[PDB]
Amino acid sequence: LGSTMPPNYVARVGQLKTFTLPETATGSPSDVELGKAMINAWREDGILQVSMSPRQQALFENASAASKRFFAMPPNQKAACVDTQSYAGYIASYSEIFTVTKDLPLDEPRVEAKWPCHGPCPWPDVDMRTPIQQYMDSLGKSGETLLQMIEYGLSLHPDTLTSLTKDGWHHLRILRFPQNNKKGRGIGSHTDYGLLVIAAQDEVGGLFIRPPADDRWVYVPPVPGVFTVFPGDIMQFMTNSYLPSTPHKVGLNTRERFAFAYFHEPSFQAVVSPVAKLYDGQPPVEKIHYGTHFTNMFMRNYPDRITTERIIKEDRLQLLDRPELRTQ
Numbered sequence: 001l002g003s004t005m006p007p008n009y010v011a012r013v014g015q016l017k018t019f020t021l022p023e024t025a026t027g028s029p030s031d032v033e034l035g036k037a038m039i040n041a042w043r044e045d046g047i048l049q050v051s052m053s054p055r056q057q058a059l060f061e062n063a064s065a066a067s068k069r070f071f072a073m074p075p076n077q078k079a080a081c082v083d084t085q086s087y088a089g090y091i092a093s094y095s096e097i098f099t100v101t102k103d104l105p106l107d108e109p110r111v112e113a114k115w116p117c118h119g120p121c122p123w124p125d126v127d128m129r130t131p132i133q134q135y136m137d138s139l140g141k142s143g144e145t146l147l148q149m150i151e152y153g154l155s156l157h158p159d160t161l162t163s164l165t166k167d168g169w170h171h172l173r174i175l176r177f178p179q180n181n182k183k184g185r186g187i188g189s190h191t192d193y194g195l196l197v198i199a200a201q202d203e204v205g206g207l208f209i210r211p212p213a214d215d216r217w218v219y220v221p222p223v224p225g226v227f228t229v230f231p232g233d234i235m236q237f238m239t240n241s242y243l244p245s246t247p248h249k250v251g252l253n254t255r256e257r258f259a260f261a262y263f264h265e266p267s268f269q270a271v272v273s274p275v276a277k278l279y280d281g282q283p284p285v286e287k288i289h290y291g292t293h294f295t296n297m298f299m300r301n302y303p304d305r306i307t308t309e310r311i312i313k314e315d316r317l318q319l320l321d322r323p324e325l326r327t328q
């Protein structure tokens with residue numbers, strides 16, 4: 001067994017299905033079968049595991065070392081990693097996070113135009129950049145494949161999902177959780193606001209998920225060599241909950257935990273519409289502008305951040321009513 005389950009936590013140990021993703025998804029009968037089997041795993045368990053190739057496993061090991069190095073920095077070398085235009089940077093709460101949003105230079109056209117959330121990432125040095133960025137380029141390649149497989153298994157119109165993620169606002173949440181000695185939680189029960197979540201953890205362990213109802217909590221054990229995938233609120237909105245939005249909570253174990261939360265997202269300028277085929281005939285009139293969706297939550301979950309104060313003081317929430325921030 002193992003019992004790597006954090007202490008004082010009642011849950012069922014989960015037996016997950018690992019899958020091996022192609023490097024190049026083409027629409028072959030094998031890809032369609034793999035997609036439909038993965039769709040079945042998300043509808044029965046709410047989460048599934050994907051095997052890492054040796055290249056993917058090495059980028060993950062390089063990125064896992066860089067994270068321990070950042071959190072090993074002094075409490076003020078870390079606090080100085082904040083930008084006035086980007087939500088990227090360090091947060092300390094009882095986890096600690098370093099979020100990597102789209103790293104855009106000061107002279108980039110969308111940064112010059114004061115678009116909300118757009119700006120350069122506050123790296124301590126190029127030694128955290130090369131590692132985590134190369135992991136995000138590999139995780140991005142997996143995100144596009146995972147979406148193509150959902151398209152083939154839900155028999156969706158080709159490029160129904162990959163058309164929104166061209167210039168996707170993919171972001172990574174580099175997580176470190178403390179030991180148990182809130183006052184007893186890492187993160188409470190919550191669902192992800194995005195499309196897909198590719199997650200990774202070390203051997204300590206502490207993730208719990210809630211599977212989709214048939215017609216209690218499940219502990220996700222740390223299997224080496226694999227990463228987990230579960231969908232978010234945007235996927236549930238597009239699919240009329242045919243693919244779920246998995247609720248999940250993180251508990252503190254007897255050691256410190258190091259984890260990664262990758263969000264494969266639509267473009268900041270994407271207008272996500274529901275899939276009519278999966279709404280029995282009547283799709284809602286509601287559409288979600290991802291840029292507004294993202295800005296509203298981050299100017300909300302991080303309300304006293306100087307990134308949020310500058311948006312209200314430069315009225316950047318107005319560029320969101322402009323059509324150029326709504327056309328990809």
Ligand SMILES: O=C(O)CCC(=O)C(=O)O
Nearest residue numbers: 199200201207259260261
């Ligand atoms: O906090 C989350 O939403 C994901 C955390 C995670 O990936 C983990 O602890 O394994």
Ligand SMILES: [Mn+2]
Nearest residue numbers: 190191192248
């Ligand atoms: Mn989450």
